[PDB]
Amino acid sequence: AAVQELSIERLLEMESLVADPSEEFQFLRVGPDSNVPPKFRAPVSSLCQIGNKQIAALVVWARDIPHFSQLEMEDQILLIKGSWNELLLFAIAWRSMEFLTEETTSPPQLMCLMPGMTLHRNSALQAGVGQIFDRVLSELSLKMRTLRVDQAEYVALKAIILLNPDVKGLKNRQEVEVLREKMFLCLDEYCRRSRSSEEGRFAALLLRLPALRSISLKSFEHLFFFHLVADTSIAGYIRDALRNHA
Numbered sequence: 673a674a675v676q677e678l679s680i681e682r683l684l685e686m687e688s689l690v691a692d693p694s695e696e697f698q699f700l701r702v703g704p705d706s707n708v709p710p711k712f713r714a715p716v717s718s719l720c721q722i723g724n725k726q727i728a729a730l731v732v733w734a735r736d737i738p739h740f741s742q743l744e745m746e747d748q749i750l751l752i753k754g755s756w757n758e759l760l761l762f763a764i765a766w767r768s769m770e771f772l773t774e775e776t777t778s779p780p781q782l783m784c785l786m787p788g789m790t791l792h793r794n795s796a797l798q799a800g801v802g803q804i805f806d807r808v809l810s811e812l813s814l815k816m817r818t819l820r821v822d823q824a825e826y827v828a829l830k831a832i833i834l835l836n837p838d839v840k841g842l843k844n845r846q847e848v849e850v851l852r853e854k855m856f857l858c859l860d861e862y863c864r865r866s867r868s869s870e871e872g873r874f875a876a877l878l879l880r881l882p883a884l885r886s887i888s889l890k891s892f893e894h895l896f897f898f899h900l901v902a903d904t905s906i907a908g909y910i911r912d913a914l915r916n917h918a
């Protein structure tokens with residue numbers, strides 16, 4: 673490999689990589705404090721495990737983002753802790769585009785949690801999370817299909833979501849701002865070259881971020897309500913996952 677650069681091409685190469693499943697930690701879990709009825713505990717636990725695998729993959733991915741490992745370790749941890757939930761929802765929205773009814777405001781009925789696994793709207797309603805389910809499919813999936821967001825833009829936005837200089841607690845915020853600025857320049861360039869006829873495309877893409885942030889906060893409201901998230905242990909899981917060993 674050559675001195676790696678933070679570029680769209682490199683992020684596309686990284687998106688396809690599949691690393692040996694790193695030992696995963698319990699970010700999400702059905703525990704003794706979870707109000708999930710016995711009859712739904714096995715399936716909810718299975719969903720948490722699917723989530724934990726995707727989070728493990730996210731950690732491996734972040735660690736390989738050009739220059740990320742150069743950041744102070746405690747900052748790496750904060751960036752991942754602050755964006756894992758947004759990144760999971762963003763991926764769910766991206767995968768869910770294919771299940772949207774052909775191009776009237778009938779709510780989409782299927783959410784793609786992973787390949788070969790869809791969550792039907794009725795199950796979401798039954799669990800009490802129909803509102804957020806609809807927000808994910810309308811404010812993210814539908815908007816992205818309408819904007820024809822492509823793979824290059826999707827991976828650029830993922831890097832931008834991760835490299836958030838506004839995360840509270842960072843020791844060297846300027847180092848994160850610089851990386852996010854590198855991505856803004858990369859993305860703007862891509863839009864101008866690959867979609868020159870679409871003025872304002874770059875700005876349109878960035879509008880999906882505040883929506884994702886709002887949806888993520890609502891996601892946490894639910895995870896805390898059902899006691900499905902290992903809040904106080906997460907920083908440690910990331911710390912351990914980063915020094916690898918899994």
Ligand SMILES: C/C=C/CC/C=C/CC/C=C/CCCCCCC(=O)OC[C@H](COP(=O)(O)OCCN)OC(=O)CCCCCCC/C=C/C/C=C/CCC
Pocket residue numbers: 700707708709712715716719720723760761783785791795796798799800801802804805808891894895898900
């Ligand atoms: C961020 C995404 C990461 C990946 C997902 C991992 C998180 C956990 C699972 C999320 C799946 C959505 C709900 C589907 C539940 C399936 C089982 C079911 O129907 O339970 C009904 C039960 C009726 O019980 P009962 O109420 O006692 O009895 C009622 C029977 N009528 O309901 C329950 O047991 C409550 C289940 C609580 C699920 C928490 C939602 C997690 C946060 C949402 C994040 C955004 C994702 C959008 C999903 C739509």
